[PDB]
């Protein structure tokens, strides 16, 4: 039952107000002891407690940015709202909401899947996905590796699947890297060689920030 | 503000063996019958998951191979025995006072048998060449340990400019790593030379793994 999901901008203009929403079910924020809090994680960096609200509307903020923080709850709709004024580059992070289950100890027992927030002057750019096939002059095989090259996009995240999630095992989606102000991401899938091209291998590349979803069927080079 | 220092920062342990992680707090996080320390396991691409509350309380649904100990300033989480799915980062967290803070985290490498990389090379797509880009990708898949060297050569000579590398987090099933080396250049610059080769040197390799694309076929 207990699910929390973050929703937020994705990209933000420096000095504009970051506004995050934490929808939840499986519990009620009027149950005695219950609380909801926000923790944020920059890229490859550690964890930072921002704020939280208890069942009785007692609020707490990180002093370091207390100037900028505002939290509230809609117990009726089962939602919590966080606003962070004068948003700046260093506020670029994954923002989590998590539940505090009791009055007795402040630990975080259920977390949402996160909400990637970038804040930058850079323009929301969709990806060009390119199919990666061996090429005419191939090799003996036994197993065959295909791939998709997701290039010249901003901001993160990009979400890569194969055959709409049907082809999960033997996959390697590589972390994004930022050449200029555009992210470059690759992903590989490894199939029994016999199965391709007889059975279709399609890579699915969604970039929600640019409202874009690209299917790319991997087909032999021929020529 | 209570500063939590984790020790060690990184730890490599073999399956069935014991990972030990210290968390030292700049002030006592224990008073009047309570030790206000908490432990989380963060796997790549997921939020942290609660293992231990109040120093030694095993959170329901979590196996007892996670034990928490310590009191006052010095706290200890033991994963024992370690398993494949422990290829994660581990955080301590105190609720002694505001502000609430976490340690910098401890990444646990699961030690496994040496594995050599599977190297696969790809020429630029027809779609990319149309926009006037040229990206030769190189996948080095399911190798161990982490350390790998990729040397690119555009027709005999190594190219230092326009190479971008990327390692996967340790797979939580087979405990291997993977890596993409992408060689990006202008489609005109790509159409000067014809021999592209992708050299891979790993601990297990007695000689390199060379992978070539003849543009002539």
């Amino acid at each position: 039952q207990v699910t929390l999901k973050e929703s937020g901008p994705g990209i933000l203009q420096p000095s504009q107000t970051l506004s995050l929403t934490c929808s939840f079910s499986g519990f009620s924020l009027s149950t005695s002891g219950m609380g909801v809090g926000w923790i944020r994680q920059p890229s490859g960096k550690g964890l930072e407690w921002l704020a939280h609200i208890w069942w009785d509307d007692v609020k707490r903020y990180n002093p370091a940015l207390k100037s900028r923080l505002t939290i509230s709850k809609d117990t009726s709709s089962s939602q919590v709202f966080l606003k962070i004024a004068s948003g700046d580059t260093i506020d670029t992070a994954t923002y989590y909401c998590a539940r505090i289950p009791t009055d007795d100890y402040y630990a975080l027992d259920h977390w949402g899947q996160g909400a990637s927030v970038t804040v930058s002057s850079a323009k929301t750019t969709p990806p060009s996905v390119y199919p990666l096939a061996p090429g005419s002059a191939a090799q003996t095989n036994s197993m065959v590796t295909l791939g998709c090259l997701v290039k010249g996009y901003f901001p993160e995240p990009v979400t890569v699947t194969w055959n709409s999630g049907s082809l999960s095992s033997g996959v390697h989606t590589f972390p994004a890297v930022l050449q200029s102000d555009l992210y470059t991401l690759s992903s590989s899938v490894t199939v029994p060689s016999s199965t391709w091209p007889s059975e279709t291998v399609t890579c699915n590349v969604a970039h929600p920030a640019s409202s874009t979803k690209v299917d790319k069927k991997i087909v032999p080079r021929d020529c | 503000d209570i500063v939590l220092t984790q020790s060690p920062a990184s730890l490599a342990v073999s399956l069935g063996q014991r990972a030990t992680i210290s968390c030292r707090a700049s002030k006592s996080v224990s008073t009047s019958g309570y030790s206000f320390m908490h432990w989380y396991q963060q796997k790549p691409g997921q939020p942290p998951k609660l293992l231990i509350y109040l120093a030694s309380n095993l959170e329901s649904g979590v196996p007892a191979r996670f034990s928490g100990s310590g009191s006052g300033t010095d706290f200890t989480l033991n994963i024992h025995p370690v398993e494949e799915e422990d290829a994660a980062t581990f955080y301590c967290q105190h609720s002694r006072e505001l502000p609430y803070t976490f340690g910098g985290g401890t990444k646990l490498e699961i030690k496994r048998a040496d594995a050599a990389p599977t190297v696969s090379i790809f020429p630029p797509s027809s779609e990319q060449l149309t926009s006037g880009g040229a990206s030769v990708v190189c996948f080095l898949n399911n190798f161990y340990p982490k350390d790998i060297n990729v040397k690119w050569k555009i027709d005999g000579s190594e190219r230092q400019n326009g190479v971008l590398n990327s390692w996967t987090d340790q797979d939580s099933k087979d405990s291997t790593y993977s890596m993409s080396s992408t060689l990006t250049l202008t489609k005109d610059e790509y159409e000067r030379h014809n021999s592209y080769t992708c050299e891979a040197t790993h601990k297990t390799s007695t000689s390199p793994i060379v992978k070539s694309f003849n543009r002539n076929e």
Binding site: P63, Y105 | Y34
Partner: peptide, 15 residues
């Protein structure tokens, strides 16, 4: 209604 040591310690350290 049964104030906890946690929310007390929090209150005492709050700004």
């Amino acid at each position: 209604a049964s104030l906890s040591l946690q929310r007390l310690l929090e209150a005492l350290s709050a700004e």
